[model samples]
Target: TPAIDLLKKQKIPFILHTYDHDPNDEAAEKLGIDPNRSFKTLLVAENGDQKKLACFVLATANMLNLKKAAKSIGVKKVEMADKDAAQKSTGYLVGGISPLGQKKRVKTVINSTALEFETIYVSGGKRGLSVEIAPQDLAKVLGAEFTDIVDE
Candidate 1:
């Protein structure tokens, strides 16, 4: 998978996990993992250009604050990319978008709260797939910054 390939290329160690995906169920809850360590990848567009996008990774239980996210990149506004746009930009479906190995390299940010975990889980670019890796390793893999991107 693209996600694992990127991790291997970057020499980042990770563990793989898989669970039956239920479209009707919450992903993190379905995985039966600690919600704080389970992340969801989101694609957002700056201003309105679908081509101009960035990835926001955060705990599944949290919410991405569009205003804070735009501010992190010095932009005035941002909105969640539409389903089609998100898949097109990330090369993964909405429920399985991974911050690593995005088709387009856009700014990526991990919620600061995720840094509290030694290892966190993110989608492995497909439904039912997940990768567990150290937060620092994930940052290194994506060249991502930790910011307060989640809504209070």
Candidate 2:
């Protein structure tokens, strides 16, 4: 509902996906989707504005190095945004942060490598719901710059 409203307002296209989310389900395993195509959003807080937040997207198997991200963003210190803060800022639960829309306009950066895929899946604001879209579309919607922060 919220996702649809935002996408409609922005004229950004997205595909909704629903899957079974098992507590025992690993991000890749539980999603039962293509690992390379599936992405997870991370809540990150940068040093320059500790109160300001950002989102990071990575392949199911990849991890963002804080040092690399900070350097890429030209910041001195960076870390995962506190989970509570993330929930507070986005108005969505931890596992449901989508780059398409949010309650706040936070800085966003994506691993440039994800662009290699034709289509990618990210959360659609609720557990078990996701959006399938092109990386370029995501970049345009989030205004997120791509960086080599993720080590494939």
Candidate 3:
């Protein structure tokens, strides 16, 4: 009586369009929103010396310039890794975990340019995966900064 399945079939404000729900080359087209507002998390690590890991969030349309962050923070290098730390901490299920909840362990970074748009989406915790929020609010809630580190 209160969930997505047959509830979608019942035609309520709880919209559930029938379509290909799989992850794809073009994701935002599914909702027809400006995809730039569709943000994504770029997971990075501070080498073996740093555990508990770290990450970044940015507009999905823009690219993380990989190691270019080295020059700015004396980061030496920046590279991608699986978000195993998140899984270990939450111990729940699915990439559906809102990566933001873990921000307390380590403050992170995001490409500052996209923060100009007051609304964006990244992640939502638990089996229900979703995010449509802004940088000011996210950093305000999670303690982060949008900085001049990574290039698009």
Best by lDDT: 1
TM, every model: 0.93, 0.87, 0.65
Query: What is the per-residue lDDT of model 2 for residues 1-152, given as tens digits with 9 covering 90 to 100?
Result: 57667878988877877777755414456657778788888777888354777777877678878888887767787888887888777888876676666778887888888789888888887777888888998888878888887864
Give the TM-score (vs. native) of candidate 2.
0.87
Worst 10 residues of 3 by lDDT: 10-19
| lDDT tens digits, residue span 1-152, model 1 | 78989888878899988888756625567778888889998888999778889888899888899999999877889988978988877888777788888888899899999889888999988888899989988988788999999886
Worst 10 residues of 1 by lDDT: 21-30
Sort by lDDT, best first.
1, 2, 3
Off by over 4 Å in 1: 22-27
Off by over 4 Å in 2: 22-31
**Error of model 3, residue 151, in angstroms:** 4.0
- Cα error, residue 119 of model 1, in Å, equals 0.4
Better of 1 and 2 by TM-score: 1
Superposed Cα deviation of residue 135, candidate 3 (Å): 1.8
Candidate with maximal TM-score: 1
